Amino acid sequence: STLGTVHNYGDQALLLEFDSTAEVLAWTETLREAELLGVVDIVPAARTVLVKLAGPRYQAPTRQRLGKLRVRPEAITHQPPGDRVDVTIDVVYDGADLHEVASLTGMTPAQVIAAHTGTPWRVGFCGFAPGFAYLVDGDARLQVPRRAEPRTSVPAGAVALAGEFSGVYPRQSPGGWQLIGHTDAVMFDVNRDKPALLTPGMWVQFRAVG
Amino acid sequence: STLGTVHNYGDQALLLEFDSTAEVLAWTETLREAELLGVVDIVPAARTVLVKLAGPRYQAPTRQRLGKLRVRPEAITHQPPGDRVDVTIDVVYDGADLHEVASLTGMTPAQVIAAHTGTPWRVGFCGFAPGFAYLVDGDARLQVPRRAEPRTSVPAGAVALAGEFSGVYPRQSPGGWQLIGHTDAVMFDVNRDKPALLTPGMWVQFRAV
Amino acid sequence: GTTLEVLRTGPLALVEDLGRPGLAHMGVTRSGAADRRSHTLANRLVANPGESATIEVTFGGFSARVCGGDVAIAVTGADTDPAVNGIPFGTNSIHHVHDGQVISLGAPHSGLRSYLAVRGGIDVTPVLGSRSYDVMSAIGPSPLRPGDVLPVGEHTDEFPELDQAPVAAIAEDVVELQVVPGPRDDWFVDPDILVRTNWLVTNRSDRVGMRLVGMPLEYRNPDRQLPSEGATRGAIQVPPNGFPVILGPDHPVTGGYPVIGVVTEEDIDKLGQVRPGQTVRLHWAYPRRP
Amino acid sequence: GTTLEVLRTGPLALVEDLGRPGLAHMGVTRSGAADRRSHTLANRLVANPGESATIEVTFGGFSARVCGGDVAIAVTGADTDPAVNGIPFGTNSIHHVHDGQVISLGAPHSGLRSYLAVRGGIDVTPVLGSRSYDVMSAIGPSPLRPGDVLPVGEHTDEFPELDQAPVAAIAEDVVELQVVPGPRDDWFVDPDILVRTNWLVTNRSDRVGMRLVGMPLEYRNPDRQLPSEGATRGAIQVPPNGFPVILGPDHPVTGGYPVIGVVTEEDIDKLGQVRPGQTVRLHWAYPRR
Ligand SMILES: [Cl-]
Structure with a gap:
């Protein structure tokens, strides 16, 4: 598989478009392994990859190098090997939208909690805020749309859902995701040896407090 | 006669409306002579008189006092009383637009100069710059429109026309008026006993040299 | 000394x-x-x-x-x-x-x-x-x-x-100002736009006047010329572009733009403390009527 | 020491x-x-x-x-x-x-x-x-x-x-900035309004973003949601209100607003010198298609 659309993102970055998160993740590793000259950062997201460059001079040469890259695997994983999960996050399922998620998914609140805790999630990529991890490969039944309008304030440790993702809000902030509960786990701490609790590639298990 | 429309101009001023500059100048005298309590300034203009007050407390008492004021019909004048003028300004009629004014007014440059010098003008109001006086009640034949685009620099002492007005530019500045000549008279001097040569209500005679 | x-x-x-x-x-x-x-x-x-x-x-x-x-x-x-x-x-x-x-x-x-x-x-x-x-x-x-x-x-x-x-x-942030309506509020299609708009203060503001930007005030008769009239600080002029100007201490003695309203005395000094980039909200001191 | x-x-x-x-x-x-x-x-x-x-x-x-x-x-x-x-x-x-x-x-x-x-x-x-x-x-x-x-x-x-x-x-006063069009200029009814408007800088501007006000940019599909994407400083986001925000050094790594254009590297540092109340004029670095 070859690249799709490659936009110039200003004069010193390139925005790569993809049809799925699975393709975003596969291409991220390919780009990361390619160790391209002038690349400052590789920013995977839901349907794109932003390749940030050291200067405008790198733009056209990087576009050319990108054309020679081929998606290294094409065969990917959606289950934790050895059944060992990297981290377990304990959640109190008292979220504001728990009953709404139940209605939208065609499940009861009990089934929502059981689905969220029953299938481990993989941290696909980080974005939004320091320590905010977009989780993938969890229970597909949980797929729920974003809120019509974002909330002004969502509490720190808010466990949420949107589209194919789950995630934990590291600090109090505005948010448009569907809130199902909260955790007392510290997602981000600048003084901790590993500042962000969740790193891309890690497998997470959610566990209900009770 | 009595006052017409009296607008509140904020909470410490009043704007009096008039049908002519002659009425503005007669009511200015009436207001000056009334020596109203709290009046900071009396600002005559084309069709109005702005009475500036010391504070909001003076607004209603002034409105009441204003209602009892009367102007004599005689005080509303369009020619100098006794034909006597206050100041004579000597002008060299070498203006850039003299020939254009002639074409626009349907007169010759000789007739333009004669009309400008033949009928005295009254200083209606000051504006634009210190010492810039808008002159009214001169020869009506001279009525010419403003220039399409303003000049970047008009000289200090430029004698000009626009609409129903004539005026002398006090300093070098941009200007959109039609230039008919120039004077060596000092329009405005901060160190002179009377800084502005022309004060509202005064009658001016222009003289060709 | x-x-x-x-x-x-x-x-x-x-x-x-x-x-x-x-x-x-x-x-x-x-x-x-x-x-x-x-x-x-x-x-x-x-x-x-x-x-x-x-x-x-x-x-x-x-x-x-x-x-x-x-x-x-x-x-x-x-x-x-x-x-x-x-x-x-x-x-x-x-x-x-x-x-x-x-x-x-x-x-x-x-x-x-x-x-x-x-x-x-x-x-x-x-x-x-x-x-x-x-x-x-x-x-x-x-x-x-x-x-x-x-x-x-x-x-x-x-x-x-x-x-x-x-x-x-x-x-x-937001500066609220009381405005006495008039004398030329009748010149505008909708003068109440003045009192329902978040006006932004520009960097062109000085002691001659505060320049505001927002929804332009349209004139009923756009080509209409107002004979020059005496002005005061706090007077809100509306030039042909429809962007209000609040006259400062250095305003000229007379002006040729219609005045939609005049800031009350109590709020006039507040104008001397409004920074470029701030929002100004205007309110009628009392209702306007024909 | x-x-x-x-x-x-x-x-x-x-x-x-x-x-x-x-x-x-x-x-x-x-x-x-x-x-x-x-x-x-x-x-x-x-x-x-x-x-x-x-x-x-x-x-x-x-x-x-x-x-x-x-x-x-x-x-x-x-x-x-x-x-x-x-x-x-x-x-x-x-x-x-x-x-x-x-x-x-x-x-x-x-x-x-x-x-x-x-x-x-x-x-x-x-x-x-x-x-x-x-x-x-x-x-x-x-x-x-x-x-x-x-x-x-x-x-x-x-x-x-x-x-x-x-x-x-x-x-x-007037700051003139060069903008590379896109990637989401197609989200706007008239993206060219961006380069024909006198944008005013508000006092709400900070290192997260410069807030501009003027004639709002209307979306072609107002209820359309953009999946979050990586952003850079100098990127011009257009939130639903249509008032552009030029991202500063403290912008979050990803954003959810369509980006109409991105300020060129030559002009990105000029953004750090724009005072509230100044006028920002934007221009396409090269023709938009
Ligand atoms: Cl470079």
Whole structure:
């Protein structure tokens, strides 16, 4: 598989478009392994990859190098090997939208909690805020749309859902995701040896407090 | 006669409306002579008189006092009383637009100069710059429109026309008026006993040299 | 005697007083301090007569060195964290400065204009009976420059440092202003747009007028010319582009734009403290009617 | 050692450097000096490496006393008429300050941010490999306060001082910016309005984003949601209200708003010098298709 659309993102970055998160993740590793000259950062997201460059001079040469890259695997994983999960996050399922998620998914609140805790999630990529991890490969039944309008304030440790993702809000902030509960786990701490609790590639298990 | 429309101009001023500059100048005298309590300034203009007050407390008492004021019909004048003028300004009629004014007014440059010098003008109001006086009640034949685009620099002492007005530019500045000549008279001097040569209500005679 | 040597000015440092009232008969505007209450306070703090000149500083950054004796000073208006040889002394308070010391105003975050008063006043030569600089006509003492030496007027060293009324803080974001409707509100298709719009203050604002941008006010008759009329500070002119201008102390004596409303007296000094980039909200002082 | 004691800050004085790049994998933005050219200039004048931290001063008004020895400093960016014990020394020039003297920046009329560099750099503790303060996540050395004691890093004593190329003056009112069109210009009914409007800068502008106001940009599909995507400083986001925001150094790593265009590298640092109430005019770097 070859690249799709490659936009110039200003004069010193390139925005790569993809049809799925699975393709975003596969291409991220390919780009990361390619160790391209002038690349400052590789920013995977839901349907794109932003390749940030050291200067405008790198733009056209990087576009050319990108054309020679081929998606290294094409065969990917959606289950934790050895059944060992990297981290377990304990959640109190008292979220504001728990009953709404139940209605939208065609499940009861009990089934929502059981689905969220029953299938481990993989941290696909980080974005939004320091320590905010977009989780993938969890229970597909949980797929729920974003809120019509974002909330002004969502509490720190808010466990949420949107589209194919789950995630934990590291600090109090505005948010448009569907809130199902909260955790007392510290997602981000600048003084901790590993500042962000969740790193891309890690497998997470959610566990209900009770 | 009595006052017409009296607008509140904020909470410490009043704007009096008039049908002519002659009425503005007669009511200015009436207001000056009334020596109203709290009046900071009396600002005559084309069709109005702005009475500036010391504070909001003076607004209603002034409105009441204003209602009892009367102007004599005689005080509303369009020619100098006794034909006597206050100041004579000597002008060299070498203006850039003299020939254009002639074409626009349907007169010759000789007739333009004669009309400008033949009928005295009254200083209606000051504006634009210190010492810039808008002159009214001169020869009506001279009525010419403003220039399409303003000049970047008009000289200090430029004698000009626009609409129903004539005026002398006090300093070098941009200007959109039609230039008919120039004077060596000092329009405005901060160190002179009377800084502005022309004060509202005064009658001016222009003289060709 | 005693002088202040200007070391640095900041964006605009002007000598200001009560201005030159009653001079419309010569085409001269009143001018004077943009924020009269702050100017008056600075002078009261140092026990000056109310006519004394202060230095109106814009965006802070003004510094001056004292020479020839000791001075009592006060800084009012925008809080610039004023200091004497790096030691802060506080806005709205009298401070004694010694011969050789440097008075330094910092940069405010809230408000725009600060007033430096000195006991005896800034004794520059008056022009048309005022020490105020008029930005538009260029009448009065020139805008201050580094190297200028300003005389301090004669005064008695002893005076009573009276207890003063507390100072209301300057609006940091939205500035709410009361507006007396008219006289030309009838010139506009919808004059109520004035009182329902979040007006932004531009960097083109000065002592001639505050420029606002937002939903343009459309004229009923766009080609209609208003005969020139006397104006006052606080008057809201609406030029043909429909962007209101709130006239400042240096406005010309007469203007040719229709005035939609005039800011009430109580809110006029607030205008002297509105920073570019801030939002202005206008409200009718009383309802308008035909 | 040698320190700088903060006496007065002005509206906002921050420790800044070239930022913390490469941290998207932990949701951390690069941050750093809002005007990178001026920051690097201030370091070069004092012969510091480019990585040394400076103090980014907003609207001037910053004062610091030197303690424990002599220092070499430089002030770049907005011209604040900097002074030592009230005596001016000039922006964009190396200056030598003695133990006990007061460095004082005044207030600029043109530009917004000034950079105070010191030979050896502002040696505060790095956070995630950077001495930059990120206003959004509050990562980095805290905003400066009176009483703060800033250490001066170790340095050699290399003389003479290298002469630097002259500096172009900062735009006083109308700032003209070049914009690379896209990637989401197709989301807007008339993207060309962006380059025909006098945008006004609001006082709500900060290092997260410059907020512009004018005629709102309408969306072709107003209820359409963009999946979150990586952003850069200089990217022009258009939230649903249609008022563009030009992202600053403290923008989050990803954003949810369609980006109409991105300011060119040549013009990105000019963004750090735009004052509230100024006019911003945008222009396509190359034709839009
Ligand atoms: Cl380059």
